[PDB]
């Protein structure tokens, strides 16, 4: 495609009076890449529909063209692509050498036009500085020192309010690998859920990054005992957009594993990485019982009376009477459930806490309250009215 | 050249726009005394 090789060159050789002070090294090094379609940060127009991970070798040239970009199209082309797309280079040798380059250039833009009301467009140059601060200190010094600088970024999210959601995504992007390297994936699962809610227009992504994104979303739910289960990842258009094998099928295997309760199906298809930690096998017992514990008041069961014995729960969880008493106590201790336990009469009273996304079984049982109360309208209701 | 002339004529009229607010505000303080 000659779009970037021609239209971009013709625009600079015709409009903007006579030339935008063209350098002789621009058109000379542009033909080195030929038709291979690596445009090295294709610079706005052509970059919108064409993007790749290739490392740009022009970094020492277009970096000084920011002054030419103000009169060219818009200053918003820096946050959409180019400098903002440098994260796809995967070059860790440039670390700490791009800090002064990606900062002082934005400091001049903040001290030039924008003050309070500004001029021309609005809402630019806010998250541009905050995006590169968290990505830098994540490397080098340990995560303890990196969190100290995240407090200034967390207060900005609660105070400042802007139209683009990149402020929310950029803060949690670095915070994802914070809890990923550490334990306690419950906080990482809540963070992983905040990436995808509804974005139609934004967050351009190909099939390569969807598999990398689904990796952090899946692992978050392995140890995560909160907010439903892997089925939430299936509710979003993810599993249909990724491959069904190579350890991406854990959503399908663990879906029925919380019902039938067979640990030999999942443990046989996985590696020794996640099977060494016994905690993973513990959290799978909670989500299996939580499905039946939500049926105690009103979901499926007809009479809507809440009672549970030690024998009925032992067969559903595939655990003996001694291990099921300890499993309920640990479930309430984690904040997932409430209530008390009666060992004398073999009664289990658990307060409803964790919601569910299932439906269709509550329509018939809600009619019970509709029909039984309607009979009093014809009998008792008409008795007081016809008085 | 054109930037200094365009910004001067713009702020010259906007200064009178601010003066349009006090014209009604003068009659507001006179009636309350």
């Amino acid at each position: 495609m000659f779009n970037n090789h021609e239209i971009d060159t013709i625009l600079s050789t015709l409009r903007m009076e006579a030339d935008p002070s063209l350098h002789p090294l621009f058109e000379q090094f542009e033909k080195f890449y030929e038709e291979k379609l690596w445009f090295q940060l294709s610079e706005s127009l052509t970059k919108f529909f064409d993007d790749a991970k290739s490392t740009p070798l022009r970094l020492r040239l277009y970096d000084n063209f920011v002054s030419k970009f103000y009169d060219k199209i818009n200053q918003l082309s820096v946050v959409k692509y180019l400098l903002a797309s440098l994260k796809d280079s995967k070059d860790f040798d440039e670390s700490l050498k791009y800090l002064d380059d990606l900062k002082a250039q934005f400091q001049e833009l903040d001290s030039k036009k924008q003050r309070n009301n500004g001029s021309k467009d609005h809402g630019d140059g806010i998250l541009l500085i905050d995006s590169e601060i968290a990505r830098t200190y994540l490397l080098k010094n340990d995560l303890v020192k990196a969190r100290d600088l995240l407090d200034d970024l967390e207060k900005t999210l609660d105070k400042k309010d802007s139209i683009p959601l990149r402020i929310t995504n950029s803060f949690y992007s670095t915070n994802s690998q914070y809890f990923k390297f550490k334990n306690d994936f419950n906080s990482f699962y809540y963070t992983s859920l905040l990436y995808l809610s509804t974005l139609e227009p934004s967050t351009s992504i190909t099939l390569a990054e969807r598999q990398q994104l689904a990796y952090d979303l899946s692992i978050s739910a392995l140890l995560g005992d909160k907010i439903y289960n892997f089925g939430e990842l299936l509710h979003h258009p993810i599993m249909e957009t990724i491959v069904n094998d190579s350890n991406y099928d854990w959503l399908f295997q663990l879906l029925n594993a919380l019902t039938v309760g067979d640990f030999d199906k999942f443990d046989s298809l996985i590696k020794v990485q996640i099977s060494k930690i016994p905690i993973l096998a513990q959290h799978e017992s909670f989500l299996r019982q939580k499905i039946c514990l939500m049926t105690l008041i009103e979901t499926v069961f007809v009479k809507n009376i809440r009672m549970l014995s030690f024998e009925d729960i032992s067969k559903a969880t595939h655990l003996p009477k001694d291990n099921v008493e300890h499993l309920v106590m640990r479930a309430i201790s984690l904040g997932l459930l409430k209530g008390s336990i009666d060992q004398v009469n073999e009664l289990v009273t658990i307060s409803w806490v964790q919601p569910r996304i299932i439906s269709g079984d509550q329509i018939t049982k809600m009619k019970d309250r509709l029909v039984e109360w309607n009979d009093q309208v014809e009998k008792l209701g008409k008795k007081m009215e016809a008085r | 050249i054109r930037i200094f002339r365009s910004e001067l004529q713009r702020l010259s009229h906007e200064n009178n726009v601010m003066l349009e607010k006090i014209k009604d505000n003068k009659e507001k303080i006179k009636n309350n005394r």
Partner: protein
């Protein structure tokens, strides 16, 4: 000379992210408002010029009919450069703007700029052209686009309205670059000349 009520239309589109045209864009639309107002209000009294925007963030009314351009320039401030494109929306807003107005029994005129080829609907713009003809509405369209733009909904909108020249609509094309914007419009029927009744 010229006694009428003119509504100005400033719109943005996917082609508003430019601003390479001579050196720039959107600075010509602001400079064109000062030339239209001074050629009308200063010519004869009882001349009020309104400003509406049917694009950008929301298709609202910026400044209605008044004797001062300060509120008109205030409407041009705080406007998104890149926004949604609806031309036919501003056509019905300008008609409702001219429907309820102070100092009735005047000459209705609408001045709009072309920021894009305006591809929306065919039969919808046909009824909008015949509706403004029965009310004797002056539709001023200055085509810009990219280089030359012909055989589209803009030319079909004019062909379905204007039999008479000065009483309905005109046509003008301004080329970007070192060209005088106010001089070509002054000699054009859009501003001054004839068409005021």
């Amino acid at each position: 000379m010229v006694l009428e009520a003119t509504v100005l239309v400033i719109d943005n589109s996917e082609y508003s992210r430019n601003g390479d045209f001579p050196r720039t864009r959107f600075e010509a639309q602001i400079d064109s408002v000062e030339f239209i107002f001074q050629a009308k209000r200063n010519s004869n009294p009882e001349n009020t010029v309104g400003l509406i925007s049917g694009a950008g963030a929301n298709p609202r009314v910026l400044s209605t009919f008044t004797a001062e351009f300060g509120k008109i320039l205030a409407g041009l401030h705080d406007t998104q450069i890149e926004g949604k494109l609806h031309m036919a929306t501003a056509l019905q807003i300008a008609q409702l703007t001219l429907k309820h107005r102070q100092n009735k029994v005047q000459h209705q005129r609408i001045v709009a700029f072309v920021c894009s080829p305006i591809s929306d609907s065919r039969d919808e713009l046909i009824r909008l052209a015949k509706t403004l003809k029965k009310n004797n509405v002056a539709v001023d369209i200055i085509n810009f686009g990219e280089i030359e733009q012909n055989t589209e909904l803009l030319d079909e909108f004019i062909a379905a309205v204007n039999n008479p020249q000065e009483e309905t609509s005109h046509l003008l094309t301004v080329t970007p670059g070192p060209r005088l914007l106010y001089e070509n419009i002054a000699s054009s029927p859009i501003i001054l000349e004839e068409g005021s009744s």
